[PDB]
Design a protein around this nucleic acid. Sequence first.
RNA 1: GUGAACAGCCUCUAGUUGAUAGAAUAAUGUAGAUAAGGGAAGUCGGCAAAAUAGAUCCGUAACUUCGGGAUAAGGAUUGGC
RNA 2: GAAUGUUACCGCAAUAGUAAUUGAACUUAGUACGAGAGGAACAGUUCAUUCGGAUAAUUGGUUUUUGCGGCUGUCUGAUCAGGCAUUGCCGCGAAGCUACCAUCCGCUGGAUUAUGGCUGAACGCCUCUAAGUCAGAAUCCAUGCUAGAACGCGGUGAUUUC
RNA 3: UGUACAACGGGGUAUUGUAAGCAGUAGAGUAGCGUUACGAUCUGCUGAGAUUAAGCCUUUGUUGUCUGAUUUGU
Lengths: 136, 131, 94, 150, 386, 87
Amino acid sequence: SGNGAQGTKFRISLGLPVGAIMNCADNSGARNLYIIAVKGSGSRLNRLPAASLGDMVMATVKKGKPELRKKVMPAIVVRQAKSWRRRDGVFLYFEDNAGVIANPKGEMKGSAITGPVGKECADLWPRVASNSGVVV
Amino acid sequence: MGRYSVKRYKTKRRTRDLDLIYNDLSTKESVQKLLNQPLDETKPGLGQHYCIHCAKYMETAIALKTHLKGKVHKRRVKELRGVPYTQEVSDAAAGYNLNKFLNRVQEITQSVGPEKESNEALLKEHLDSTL
Amino acid sequence: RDIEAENGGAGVFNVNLKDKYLLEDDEWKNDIMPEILDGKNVYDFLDPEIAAKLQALEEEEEKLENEGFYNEIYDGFEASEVDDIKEKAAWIRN
Amino acid sequence: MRIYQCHFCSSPCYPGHGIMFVRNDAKEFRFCRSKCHKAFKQRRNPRKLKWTKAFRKAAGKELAVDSTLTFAQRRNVPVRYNRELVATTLKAMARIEEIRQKRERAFYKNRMRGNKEKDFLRDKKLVESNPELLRIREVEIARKLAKEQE
Amino acid sequence: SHRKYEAPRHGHLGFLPRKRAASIRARVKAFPKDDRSKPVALTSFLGYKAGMTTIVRDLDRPGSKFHKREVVEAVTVVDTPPVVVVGVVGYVETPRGLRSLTTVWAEHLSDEVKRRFYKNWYKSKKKAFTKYSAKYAQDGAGIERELARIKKYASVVRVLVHTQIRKTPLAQKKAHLAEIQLNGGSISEKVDWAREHFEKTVAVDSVFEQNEMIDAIAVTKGHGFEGVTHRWGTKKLPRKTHRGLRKVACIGAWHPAHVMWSVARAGQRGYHSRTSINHKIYRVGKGDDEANGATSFDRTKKTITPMGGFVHYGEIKNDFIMVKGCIPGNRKRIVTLRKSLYTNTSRKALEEVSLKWIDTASKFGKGRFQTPAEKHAFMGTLKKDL
Amino acid sequence: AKSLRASSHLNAKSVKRRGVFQKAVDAREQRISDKLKEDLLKQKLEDLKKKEEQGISTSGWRDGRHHTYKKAKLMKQSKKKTSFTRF
RNA sequence: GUGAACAGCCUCUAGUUGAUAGAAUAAUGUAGAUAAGGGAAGUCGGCAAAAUAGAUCCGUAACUUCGGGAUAAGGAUUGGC
RNA sequence: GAAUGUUACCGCAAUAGUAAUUGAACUUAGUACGAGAGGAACAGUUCAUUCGGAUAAUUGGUUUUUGCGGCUGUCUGAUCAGGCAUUGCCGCGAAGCUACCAUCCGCUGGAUUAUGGCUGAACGCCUCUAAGUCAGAAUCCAUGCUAGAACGCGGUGAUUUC
RNA sequence: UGUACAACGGGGUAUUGUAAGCAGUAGAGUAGCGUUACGAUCUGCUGAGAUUAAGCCUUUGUUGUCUGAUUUGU
Ligand SMILES: [Mg+2]
Ligand SMILES: [Mg+2]
Ligand SMILES: [Mg+2]
Ligand SMILES: [Mg+2]
Ligand SMILES: [Mg+2]
Ligand SMILES: [Mg+2]
Ligand SMILES: [Mg+2]
Ligand SMILES: [Mg+2]
Ligand SMILES: [Mg+2]
Ligand SMILES: [Mg+2]
Ligand SMILES: [Mg+2]
Ligand SMILES: [Mg+2]
Ligand SMILES: [Zn+2]
Ligand SMILES: [Zn+2]
């Protein structure tokens, strides 16, 4: 489930394969994040690594501060547009795919998160829940 | 299902909602903030010439004027007249939070309504003067 | 944790969360609270003095019944005449 | 566990049914059906679509303000569990439902009064306006009666 | 030369050949091991798959993320009217395996089970077991001798039972007859139990109970002739490839000069015998319960039958078994429910199921109402009602 | 990871299996046996109520048909030389 | 008739109703379509498809043989009464 | 799919195939160990990766249900009701099919390898080895699962009035 | 020759979205003499109308059908 995550993770429908671009939901100055790798991904021929809500990816900043650009950093997905099933009894989805920039220990670079944050991601990552103002 | 509806109303191509636009138009401070925006290079027209009703940026003042002289803007204005259909409307239609919905409708009729209408009239005359 | 260790240990012991309830009767701790009845949520009907509210509703219903809330011939026409008119009109439409 | 009402048509949303959309302002839109979800995505007006409870309440097809409709509201202030209070609530829910059904029936009957008068006037006008068909009908009836007699 | 990139093979080689099953009723290949100290019990039961629905479970699972939380889970409903005991078979052990020594039938057999022995019931004189029934006269000589033979020589005892298909909504009038092993006391006690239960019925709650893991044995839904892409899960060839793209491009490129048996080929898909294990019984519902579809959390008085009935099956008016998940076979197919062959060591076998709500909305569409009364109360008064 | 056939895991499973799981299985078997006996007794009572309104050597052959068929079959096998155990 | 139009689509006059047929709807094809989330990660190679498109208005760069580029680009609109 | 009396039902099992895999988490525990910095495992529990077999309650995709409604052009005098536009186009759309885009399920006995031993000679020491013998690998053979010899077999029912 | 079967019909269950016809004083205005005429659309009768197994469920109704051919013996 990755280093820094709080416990095990149940399966969520994958919406972001490698090569996807998502928004940046923190206040570190990055505008978008380009997914190049998914942490904890398995191995199968011809299959692209994909990430869901609450996953950690390796991303490069495409738009934002030039100091943040041209570097690879860990990110945590906090919103996805692909619908997924909650065990309470509903399928649901967000407007956009959005992630936040973090460290290998799962600590946010920014100080706050704009927009809603998924319940699964907030429960899996304590620092995301600490920096979230809206949790679903 | 069909290609036209799919490629128009895809999730990633969603637009701003009527209740949010109504809340934006209700207060004079929000109207002033949307009229005086910082110069953004990622928006058409450097973030200027923004129609609040349609939530749409224009590249030029003539483009904004032609948009105002159009049926699409009139359709949006006609849509933004009555109650913005929050969740309370559907709840009271089902028979749930009826008193809350009635109080909300009364507050809209008494306080929110005429102030929003006056703000819309002021925005209209300001656009007419500056255009 | 001592109770958990003596019963099942971590991950096996099933704690009863209703044992700490501060209710008027101690026999009400292990009571299953109903949630759904005939398509309605019981939680948004649960309310003190609902008995008094229902009594007021019954008084209103009694007033309506006393007022008569719940309860073939036309000027210049008889019942047989209007029946014949309806039968002939149905024949004409068919 | 909770029954939700559809954002578009106000129908009940049982667990495992429909779909939910979350907006940027944390607003949850629950739809009982793909039909309502797609209508919402196409941005149609539920108060203009005749098959919705919003339209019916706005147009006066069914009663909207009644004393029976005030017993259900979201309780943001919980109350301590009481067995007799729960039993009283369970009985009261059935009694209120029966009274509400009776009142809705009376409302519909009051709305639909006059239909018989209109239909009788229409039938009278049709009969007065069609003499030849009535003559054909009389001839047919007389021939059938003669056939039955002989 | 070696394949450049490793990948697992497509499909399971232990489920070969992918041919149609020899019968519509799947065979039970293994019964639970017999413990001679235990009381006599049936090892299996027969039912008809009616359909699926949805439940809400108040989960108690210590150590889990969903401990003390509600979960929405899919279930399968099997209509299980009581079976009728009509025979007994004894089996002896030989160096060539188990051999059936003798079979003893009951005195009276219903027409429902007599139809199983006929291909043309309406033209037949219905003479089945007519001379056999005469062997019960004048103290049952012959019958007693064969029962004594089973007691003396048999090492395995099975009981021949049949379903009461006339209690189901099925158009088929021909009952299903099967052998069920008796696990329990001595051989003599098994024979005595069978003799006492001749022509008697056995209900499903005298075989299984709630919170038990069982196995489902059935024939899967058929699909006819199918290509390699959907039969084996092989990757499609690129667009407009010559001679088709739903194929395996090279079925052989090496010395043996034959097509290997482990290469994917087109053929029959479905209608195979399957034995799936560890399905937990969520409810053993009785047919005489007016609220067998209700729970302690949902006080609505309703049965398990959904609005409009189960699609392509009908209503449930008998005892039923609700197990979580899915089982092989389609609706209205005969299924065998078998006891577990081993004592399960997972905590799910010790978990106790408490349902909060059972879905009874219509499966013929996007059903929004649980009862017709709820539908009427929501809609109001219609034109035809006034 | 340890396989399903790992000896230490199977030994731990057997140690667990001899206890609470087997106790639960035995209790379930006793309850099921009690319900089966009750079902038989209820059927007997209903049959009695319905009738109220209305009111060993195993040697040798099984039967004559079995004797005739088996003798004919053995004679046929002897004649056709298609016997598994006898020349 | 629509429409800028000998375009496409429908109709009047005139002329045909010819091409082996019947019954089922497995796989694989030939011809034509749709698809959640991602958007070239496929492939030697964006091959193929998709996207654009009529008319009106605003506006249109480098370069240039000064004639062009140009419908450059980029925006707004279109029904009925 | 013929044939070994006919026909029907319930079964046996030679042989052939065989399947599961890896990671993380709670607890053990900030414990053993350690100046420190750091820091395990067994026993007891919970999820996930890859694979496999199913399944359609729910969500999503699909539409000749041409089921319902709408739009353009033209034609039937108009309304109504309809034709054509090589499925005219647009929206919704049950049923069926289907998706790691959906859900469920996938085990336990013997014999061993390396190695660690016991008794004990060869060789009056000694020695796990020579005779004998204890354990021990995701290994082998079985349990379990799939097919059922169309020339392998068993039990059982009925067996013709011109 | 019957909890018999079939073709219709009835009741449920689902899909769509408010039928034809009549009427109004709702309707931007324009023409004639407050009225009349034309008039996209709107409102009511009307969650109406239409469809619902062709692989949905059920049936105290109506009408019919129940029959030919071939072969098999220890
Ligand atoms: Mg590849
Ligand atoms: Mg369905
Ligand atoms: Mg797509
Ligand atoms: Mg590439
Ligand atoms: Mg590549
Ligand atoms: Mg150029
Ligand atoms: Mg073998
Ligand atoms: Mg362990
Ligand atoms: Mg599959
Ligand atoms: Mg037309
Ligand atoms: Mg020694
Ligand atoms: Mg054979
Ligand atoms: Zn505008
Ligand atoms: Zn809805």
